[PDB]
Structure 1
Amino acid sequence: WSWESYLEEQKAITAPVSLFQDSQAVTHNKNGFKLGMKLEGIDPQHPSMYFILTVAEVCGYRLRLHFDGYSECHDFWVNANSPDIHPAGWFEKTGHKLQPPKGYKEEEFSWSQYLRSTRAQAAPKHLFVSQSHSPPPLGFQVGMKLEAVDRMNPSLVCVASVTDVVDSRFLVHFDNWDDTYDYWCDPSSPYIHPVGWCQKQGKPLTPPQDYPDPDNFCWEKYLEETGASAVPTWAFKVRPPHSFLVNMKLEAVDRRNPALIRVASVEDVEDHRIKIHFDGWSHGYDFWIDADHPDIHPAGWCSKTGHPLQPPL
């Protein structure tokens, strides 16, 4: 419809561009991904693992990725500036493991030969914002230890490790646990803390799954025993709370059908999260989201990138 006339009739304002990360706001980059191009990327359900992916669909600045050899029911959407996708050949050049297409074996797979056999085009390197050609996030080296909130069970702060580093980001892993609980972040993340923070704050720390003698959990000796260092405290930066206010309007991907983006409103706020309401829909579909999530955008993003915008219902 038009944002302009909507704002007049509702007597409302949009969340200003300045409130968003540059990466959530940028509209002027073209999407150079094309149908059938091949690449590598993380599995959103197993964020430590990398698979061969194909571009199955492009919509504006977004793309839908298919896991080669597997079912289309696993396909998922990302933005073209996603740091979670990488060019063909990246895994080998940066020390990562590639899970091959269904029916291959890790060491059976070669990009040269795969491309010959498929006659497919690898997505060109220059498309990717993350190629491990930037120097890491200061002070966060693989194997180092920290305390982290289990984003799945937010009342728990837990023994955790850095297991992956890529450009300005690193992977937080829970000791003795599935990669299912892992998550990517950067040194300003509000979900991470230096070794000792729990003790110094009052809260209990959850030790590694099936550790010997859990209440008697000692960090400086866990550390000596694992040949690990804790991430230095000077490394952990303070992300300031976001400045979104209740009733500001924006555009947000609909988690019920991620192909769609909708007119939305800020229904509530915490320091680092906002509660999203889709205008014209039930408050039952209202949901909490991290302010820095890739799937929230300023008003006009859809229009400038060429993605349909769902008007209010």
Structure 2
Amino acid sequence: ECWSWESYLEEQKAITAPVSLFQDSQAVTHNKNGFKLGMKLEGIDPQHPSMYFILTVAEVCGYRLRLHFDGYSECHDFWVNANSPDIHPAGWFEKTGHKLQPPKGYEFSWSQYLRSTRAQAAPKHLFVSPPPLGFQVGMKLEAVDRMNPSLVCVASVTDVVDSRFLVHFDNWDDTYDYWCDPSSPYIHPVGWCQKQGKPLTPPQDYPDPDNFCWEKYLEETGASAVPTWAFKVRPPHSFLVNMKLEAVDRRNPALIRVASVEDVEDHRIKIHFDGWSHGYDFWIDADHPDIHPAGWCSKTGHPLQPPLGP
């Protein structure tokens, strides 16, 4: 007989995390995924989130897509959901004042590229269709380095796309950049660290870095602070320990597995994959696009890995 959530919950005397605990985008199962193998589009580089590349659909599975960077190694391929805000139709860059990195080898033109590759651009209607109030390119703020999360750092808004904006760490590598929205718990107004008595990491190689002063720095750069009213942090999530859900595997991202909430924080949850070592457990933001309610895989046509049996 087929594995099912209902039988498993019975066997385990367990419960699922209710759909209400998830963002609409994590829960939605009734959208069609119309993307097809070989279709071309634009998207951010996950490793360099400020940069936009030409991407090809290399695989379709349920409501997910594997994307390939045209011209580059297969090593760089990555999976997104079809409702990702990180992908856009051909021509988006030109329409929105962004720069498009060319395919490896490449003067660029979408019409000639499509002819050369005998390919079709993913249609505009295959993509899911308001600016973040108070966040504009060039404004400054304080932000948690999510790669070094004990550090709150001098940061800037360097891009704005739809309802989100890009946080960049002043004079640090752009690999530390990340997109977020005005409710992120990782961002704060200029002056927050002083107010909390926490140390603030200044821009890389700032002269006399112990005497870093926001007033002086804003004078040096002519930049404004993001206004305090703009920051609208979200309430803690309501996931509880032992609730079950579905989560993308971190070792092999093609796979999605049966998962449990092992531990919680205000804004994160710790995932355990049922049946596997606790050594694989990992923390993830509660709004991460790769966690889903029970039944997401079944409703979207994606295989679900059942728990590893004893």
TM-score normalized by the length of structure 1 = 0.97
Write the distance in 1 (CA, Å) between the matches of 2:14 and 2:59.
35
Query: Which consecutive unaligned segments of at least 5 residues does structure 1 have?
Result: none
Secondary structure of the equivalent of 2:269? strand
Secondary structure of the equivalent of 1:237? coil
Write the distance in 1 (CA, Å) between the matches of 2:302 and 2:241.
26
Q: Could you tell me which of 181, 197, 203 is aligned with 1:202? A: 197
Write the distance in 2 (CA, Å) between the matches of 1:95 and 1:141.
14
How far off is 1:205 after superposition?
Answer: 0.5
- The answer as to 2:120 corresponding to 1:121 is yes
CA offsets, 1:144-168, max 9 Å, x none?
A: 0000000111111000000010001
Write the distance in 2 (CA, Å) between the matches of 1:158 and 1:238.
18
Write the distance in 1 (CA, Å) between the matches of 2:241 and 2:38.
42
Write the distance in 1 (CA, Å) between the matches of 2:126 and 2:188.
34
How far off is 1:298 after superposition?
Answer: 0.1
CA offsets, 1:90-113, max 9 Å, x none?
A: 111111111100011xxx111011
How far off is 1:175 after superposition?
Answer: 0.1
How far off is 1:8 after superposition?
Answer: 0.8
How far off is 1:201 after superposition?
Answer: 0.6
Q: Structure 1 runs of 4+ off > 4 angstroms?
A: none
Task: State the number of aligned residues.
Answer: 306
Secondary structure of the equivalent of 1:122? coil
How far off is 1:225 after superposition?
Answer: 1.6
How far off is 1:238 after superposition?
Answer: 2.0
How far off is 1:135 after superposition?
Answer: 3.1
Write the distance in 1 (CA, Å) between the matches of 2:168 and 2:231.
17
Write the distance in 2 (CA, Å) between the matches of 1:62 and 1:276.
20
CA offsets, 1:2-60, max 9 Å, x none?
A: 10010011011000000000000000000010111000001111111111000010000
Query: Which consecutive unaligned segments of at least 5 residues does structure 2 have?
Result: none
TM-score normalized by the length of structure 2 = 0.98
Write the distance in 2 (CA, Å) between the matches of 1:82 and 1:228.
31
Q: Could you tell me which of 244, 249, 256 is aligned with 1:249? A: 244
**Cα root mean square deviation, aligned:** 0.8
How far off is 1:224 after superposition?
Answer: 1.9
How far off is 1:118 after superposition?
Answer: 1.5
Secondary structure of the equivalent of 1:23? helix
Aligned to 2:304: 309
Write the distance in 2 (CA, Å) between the matches of 1:198 and 1:128.
40
Aligned to 2:227: 232
Q: Could you tell me which of 29, 32, 39 is aligned with 1:30? A: 32
- Of 74-83 and 216-225, the range deviating more from structure 2: 216-225
- The answer as to 2:5 corresponding to 1:3 is yes
Write the distance in 2 (CA, Å) between the matches of 1:127 and 1:198.
43
Structure-to-structure mapping, 1:118-197, within 5 angstroms: 118-129=117-128, 135-197=130-192
Write the distance in 2 (CA, Å) between the matches of 1:262 and 1:36.
27
CA offsets, 1:170-208, max 9 Å, x none?
A: 000000011110111000000000000000011011100
How far off is 1:116 after superposition?
Answer: 1.6
Secondary structure of the equivalent of 1:29? coil
Write the distance in 1 (CA, Å) between the matches of 2:169 and 2:260.
34
How far off is 1:126 after superposition?
Answer: 1.7
Secondary structure of the equivalent of 1:73? helix
Write the distance in 2 (CA, Å) between the matches of 1:275 and 1:175.
31
How far off is 1:303 after superposition?
Answer: 0.1
CA offsets, 1:67-104, max 9 Å, x none?
A: 10111121110000000011000111111111100011
How far off is 1:288 after superposition?
Answer: 0.4
Secondary structure of the equivalent of 1:24? helix
Write the distance in 1 (CA, Å) between the matches of 2:187 and 2:234.
11
How far off is 1:221 after superposition?
Answer: 1.8
Write the distance in 1 (CA, Å) between the matches of 2:289 and 2:37.
22
CA offsets, 1:253-278, max 9 Å, x none?
A: 00100000000000000000000000
Write the distance in 1 (CA, Å) between the matches of 2:218 and 2:170.
12
How far off is 1:293 after superposition?
Answer: 0.3
Write the distance in 1 (CA, Å) between the matches of 2:207 and 2:186.
26
Write the distance in 1 (CA, Å) between the matches of 2:154 and 2:216.
13
